[PDB]
Amino acid sequence: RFLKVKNWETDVVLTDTLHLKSTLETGCTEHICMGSIMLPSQHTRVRTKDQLFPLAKEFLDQYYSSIKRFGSKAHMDRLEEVNKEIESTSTYQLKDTELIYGAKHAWRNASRCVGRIQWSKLQVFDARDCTTAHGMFNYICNHVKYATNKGNLRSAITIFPQRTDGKHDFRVWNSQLIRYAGYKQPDGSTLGDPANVQFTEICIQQGWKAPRGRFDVLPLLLQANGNDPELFQIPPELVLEVPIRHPKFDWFKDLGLKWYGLPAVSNMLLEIGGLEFSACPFSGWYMGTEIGVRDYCDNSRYNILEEVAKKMDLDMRKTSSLWKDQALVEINIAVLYSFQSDKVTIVDHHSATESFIKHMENEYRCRGGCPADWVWIVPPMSGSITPVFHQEMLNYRLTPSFEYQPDPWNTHVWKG
Amino acid sequence: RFLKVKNWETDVVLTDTLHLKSTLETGCTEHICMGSIMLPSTKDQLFPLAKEFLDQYYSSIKRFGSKAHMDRLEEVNKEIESTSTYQLKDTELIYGAKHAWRNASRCVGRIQWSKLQVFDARDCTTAHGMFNYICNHVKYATNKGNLRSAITIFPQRTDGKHDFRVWNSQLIRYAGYKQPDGSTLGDPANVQFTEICIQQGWKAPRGRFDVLPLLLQANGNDPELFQIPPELVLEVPIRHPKFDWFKDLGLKWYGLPAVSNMLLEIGGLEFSACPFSGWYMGTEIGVRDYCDNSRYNILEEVAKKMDLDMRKTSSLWKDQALVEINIAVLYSFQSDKVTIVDHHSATESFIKHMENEYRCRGGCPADWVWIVPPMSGSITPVFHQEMLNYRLTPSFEYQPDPWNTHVW
Numbered sequence: 154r155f156l157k158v159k160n161w162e163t164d165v166v167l168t169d170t171l172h173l174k175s176t177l178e179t180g181c182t183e184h185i186c187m188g189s190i191m192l193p194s195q196h197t198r199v200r201t202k203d204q205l206f207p208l209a210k211e212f213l214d215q216y217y218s219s220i221k222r223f224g225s226k227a228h229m230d231r232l233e234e235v236n237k238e239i240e241s242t243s244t245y246q247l248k249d250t251e252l253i254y255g256a257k258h259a260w261r262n263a264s265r266c267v268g269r270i271q272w273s274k275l276q277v278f279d280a281r282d283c284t285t286a287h288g289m290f291n292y293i294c295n296h297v298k299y300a301t302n303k304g305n306l307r308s309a310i311t312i313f314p315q316r317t318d319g320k321h322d323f324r325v326w327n328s329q330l331i332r333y334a335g336y337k338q339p340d341g342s343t344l345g346d347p348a349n350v351q352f353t354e355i356c357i358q359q360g361w362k363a364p365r366g367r368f369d370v371l372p373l374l375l376q377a378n379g380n381d382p383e384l385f386q387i388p389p390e391l392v393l394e395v396p397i398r399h400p401k402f403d404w405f406k407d408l409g410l411k412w413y414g415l416p417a418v419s420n421m422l423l424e425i426g427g428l429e430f431s432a433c434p435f436s437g438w439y440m441g442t443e444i445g446v447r448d449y450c451d452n453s454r455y456n457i458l459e460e461v462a463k464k465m466d467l468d469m470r471k472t473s474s475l476w477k478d479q480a481l482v483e484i485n486i487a488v489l490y491s492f493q494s495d496k497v498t499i500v501d502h503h504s505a506t507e508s509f510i511k512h513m514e515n516e517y518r519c520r521g522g523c524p525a526d527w528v529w530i531v532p533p534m535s536g537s538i539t540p541v542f543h544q545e546m547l548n549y550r551l552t553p554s555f556e557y558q559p560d561p562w563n564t565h566v567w568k569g
Numbered sequence: 570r571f572l573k574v575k576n577w578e579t580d581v582v583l584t585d586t587l588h589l590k591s592t593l594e595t596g597c598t599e600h601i602c603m604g605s606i607m608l609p610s611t612k613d614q615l616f617p618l619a620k621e622f623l624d625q626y627y628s629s630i631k632r633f634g635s636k637a638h639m640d641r642l643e644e645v646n647k648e649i650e651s652t653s654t655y656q657l658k659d660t661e662l663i664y665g666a667k668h669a670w671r672n673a674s675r676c677v678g679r680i681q682w683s684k685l686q687v688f689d690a691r692d693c694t695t696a697h698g699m700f701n702y703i704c705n706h707v708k709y710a711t712n713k714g715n716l717r718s719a720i721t722i723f724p725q726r727t728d729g730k731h732d733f734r735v736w737n738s739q740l741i742r743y744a745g746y747k748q749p750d751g752s753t754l755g756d757p758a759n760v761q762f763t764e765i766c767i768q769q770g771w772k773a774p775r776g777r778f779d780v781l782p783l784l785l786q787a788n789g790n791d792p793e794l795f796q797i798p799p800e801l802v803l804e805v806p807i808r809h810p811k812f813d814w815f816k817d818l819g820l821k822w823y824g825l826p827a828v829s830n831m832l833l834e835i836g837g838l839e840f841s842a843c844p845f846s847g848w849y850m851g852t853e854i855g856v857r858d859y860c861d862n863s864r865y866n867i868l869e870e871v872a873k874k875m876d877l878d879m880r881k882t883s884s885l886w887k888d889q890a891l892v893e894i895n896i897a898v899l900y901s902f903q904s905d906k907v908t909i910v911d912h913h914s915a916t917e918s919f920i921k922h923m924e925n926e927y928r929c930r931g932g933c934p935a936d937w938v939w940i941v942p943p944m945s946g947s948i949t950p951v952f953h954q955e956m957l958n959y960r961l962t963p964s965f966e967y968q969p970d971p972w973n974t975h976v977w
């Protein structure tokens with residue numbers, strides 16, 4: 154069965170056959186679309202030898218196809234080797250080549266990621282020999298240095314040991330490797346990043362001396378082999394930050410804003426051939442709107458629209474003045490200007506969405522499809538003047554994949 | 570099976586049971602979501618449809634299982650066995666139309682759903698008659714700029730050979746002509762229709778904002794051209810409250826958004842001609858009509874007049890111009906006292922409407938892809954609102970364009 158998507162701006166129609174290789178479920182049915190649910194049951198992640206070899210076999214079939222060795226003696230022997238290692242040891246180990254392939258294809262298959270044109274240029278750091286939280290700190294430091302590269306950002310992922318019985322998990326408790334603390338005040342107001350208040354409290358309880366400023370980089374909280382997590386401060390010279398100024402508004406610097414340069418997601422689960430890598434930090438570079446729209450202007454985040462509009466002296470009485478929309482653009486101009494001025498890699502939403510359209514068309518041509526989540530691909534400002542708004546998209550889940558997992562502090566069994 | 574939807578900006582969680590009543594299909598499966606696809610796809614079938622509708626109608630008036638209910642169910646059952654169709658009582662027709670709007674999961678304006686004015690045009694027989702009903706609709710809905718929601722319902726389909734159709738997509742739309750030199754004058758979305766108008770007899774001004782004539786088809790006959798009287802077409806010249814050069818652009822839009830090419834389904838009956846109208850949300854004109862590349866596409870021209878740095882996309886000059894254009898639209902309509910709602914006000918209304926529907930109905934089908942405005946998405950409350958999309962009936966459905974179908 155073939156399926157067609159149409160771009161209603163260009164009338165370009167593409168044909169998807171790749172959705173036929175889809176295994177996992179969407180969450181939708183014939184009678185309800187769950188397309189806007191943030192965490193469906195299926196996108197989140199306890200696994201026995203029963204279902205593991207079919208998952209291994211499918212991944213290895215995919216791997217050896219991609220290297221033009223399907224049905225080779227190398228292919229058949231590896232299947233035999235994995236089979237015996239599973240029945241003997243109940244799991245198996247990926248080769249280095251398989252791990253790299255798997256991690257790149259997990260990114261390639263991330264239907265909510267607009268930055269996937271870059272998927273083949275991913276630096277994979279094998280941290281599967283790591284055993285302790287200190288060892289994890291060292292691997293993460295090296296990732297942060299390599300990926301930052303003095304502002305010339307490089308995509309990277311660091312992969313810690315896979316889950317075994319679910320009782321010895323490696324976890325990075327931070328949602329992102331670099332994030333600002335958030336503090337709830339007795340008067341109800343929040344200082345810093347409201348998104349991080351719960352995590353900041355865990356860190357403080359674990360013994361972190363909080364500076365209690367508005368832009369305090371949080372410490373790393375690292376769990377190795379299912380032991381209690383441990384606190385580590387990222388070396389400040391490794392944390393690249395950009396002061397935010399506006400190219401025309403000199404008062405903008407006086408808002409005291411900055412942001413870190415490296416977006417590095419650290420709380421997701423990487424699934425490859427039925428193996429679960431529960432600690433797999435990955436990083437790229439920012440699209441401007443992630444900082445300027447969501448981080449600064451979400452009502453539940455830094456929420457600076459009011460103060461920015463106040464200093465612009467906009468008509469703030471009625472919303473029909475679009476003072477909210479006016480300030481949002483300026484703030485997003487400032488983020489982009491500050492990053493480019495400091496020669497820190499960033500991409501605006503116009504460039505990033507045009508690239509993704511080209512990526513997607515290329516993927517239909519060479520791969521038969523490109524799974525894409527329109528709800529997430531369309532940027533959070535100026536939607537319809539980007540070409541993805543007009544792009545029909547098919548969403549389905551391929552493996553290897555990145556999945557959500559529950560926050561560790563809700564599942565962890567504390568040792569003491 | 571009793572589903573939850575979270576708003577992530579407020580942590581409010583609503584429980585949806587209404588979707589269990591869903592009847593039609595969504596186009597998705599467990600293996601693939603088609604949430605962003607624009608248009609996914611006898612006597613026996615008719616009575617169950619009628620029963621389901623009459624069941625919900627007599628429930629809404631708290632007469633479920635009453636004498637009158639069973640009597641009406643009996644009477645419609647008899648009419649279908651006899652005539653192979655049936656006719657709605659006026660009260661049922663009004664209910665059905667209001668609920669088709671209530672059920673339109675892509676519409677952000679549905680908080681107003683119960684205040685719809687329904688014009689029963691089922692006694693209509695000719696295109697001249699259709700024209701009369703439509704002029705009355707336009708005048709009533711326009712109301713000197715104090716816009717009022719309205720629908721006019723022409724006779725239901727019978728055998729598919731006697732269809733009533735309005736060929737225009739909207740009662741009021743600007744013409745579009747291809748220029749010999751390559752580009753497009755007027756509205757590019759309306760180039761083929763502007764063709765069929767001329768190509769059926771229209772005398773075009775070949776201007777930029779020429780109101781298209783109505784192309785009315787009654788009882789499946791050939792469609793006929795009618796000019797809407799200009800004094801009924803309320804238009805707003807577009808100026809900016811800060812940029813005096815803005816007026817020089819020569820932009821205007823019409824005040825009445827009036828969809829005329831959809832199909833209204835009630836209790837299994839199909840109303841192929843059912844023009845309906847409300848009032849604009851500001852982004853419909855300014856973001857889509859003016860700035861879509863496939864439309865009037867004035868962005869580059871406006872940015873030049875603002876003297877913005879158009880060398881690189883990262884100066885966000887398109888975003889800056891886009892905001893100003895939409896400030897102007899709202900300013901112009903408000904100054905002329907023509908009803909319009911900005912996208913902040915309308916989405917806040919829709920959140921309140923969802924809360925109302927979940928509380929008094931058990932849910933509210935909603936299509937996030939269409940509810941979220943085409944600018945400033947994440948600073949409106951609907952962006953952070955999970956939504957369950959499902960198809961309830963009565964409903965508005967899309968239908969094939971008539972010129973592809975009409976046995977001429």
Ligand code: HEM
Binds near residue numbers: 260263275310438439
């Ligand atoms: C290199 C430049 C990259 C850019 C510009 C980019 C951009 C984005 C953006 C804007 C989102 C939307 C999420 C949000 O708004 O919070 C996203 C999602 C995502 N990105 Fe990328 N990204 C990049 C690199 C990467 C890399 C290196 C990986 C993994 C190896 C990755 C994996 C993902 C995944 C898994 C999601 C989905 C998150 C979810 O399902 O909730 N991205 N990306």
Ligand code: HEM
Binds near residue numbers: 685720
């Ligand atoms: C009164 C103020 C109203 C407002 C502000 C409003 C707003 C909107 C908007 C912004 C859309 C998105 C579609 C697009 O972007 O082109 C839409 C769709 C729609 N509206 Fe409403 N509307 C209003 C009244 C009505 C009325 C009176 C009806 C019918 C009785 C209606 C039925 C619909 C339907 C059926 C759709 C979606 C068509 C589809 O499925 O593609 N609307 N509306």
Ligand SMILES: Cc1cc(N)nc(CCc2cc(CC[C@@H]3CCCN3C)cc(F)c2F)c1
Binds near residue numbers: 417435
């Ligand atoms: C590598 C990279 C590059 C880039 N440019 N941006 C990112 C961040 C994108 C991103 C976000 C989230 C969580 C968003 C959270 C959860 C729900 C809503 N929000 C609160 C999870 C991810 F896996 C992810 F990749 C990553």
Ligand SMILES: Cc1cc(N)nc(CCc2cc(CC[C@@H]3CCCN3C)cc(F)c2F)c1
Binds near residue numbers: 827849850
């Ligand atoms: C009553 C009313 C009030 C208001 N404020 N706006 C409207 C117009 C919105 C609208 C659009 C469309 C088609 C959109 C077309 C077809 C494909 C994509 N697009 C180009 C169908 C509708 F039923 C509709 F209601 C109507």
Ligand SMILES: C[C@H](O)[C@H](O)[C@H]1CNc2nc(N)[nH]c(=O)c2N1
Binds near residue numbers: 161542543544605607
């Ligand atoms: C491809 C995509 O479905 C298409 O561009 C849709 C997206 N969302 C929309 N939303 C609204 N309100 N109106 C539209 O015409 C569209 N078009």
Ligand SMILES: C[C@H](O)[C@H](O)[C@H]1CNc2nc(N)[nH]c(=O)c2N1
Binds near residue numbers: 189528530954955956
């Ligand atoms: C409810 C809704 O799905 C939620 O707000 C989503 C919508 N789209 C998004 N898109 C991106 N890129 N990031 C997000 O956090 C979200 N949030």
Ligand SMILES: [Zn+2]
Binds near residue numbers: 181185603
């Ligand atoms: Zn779906």
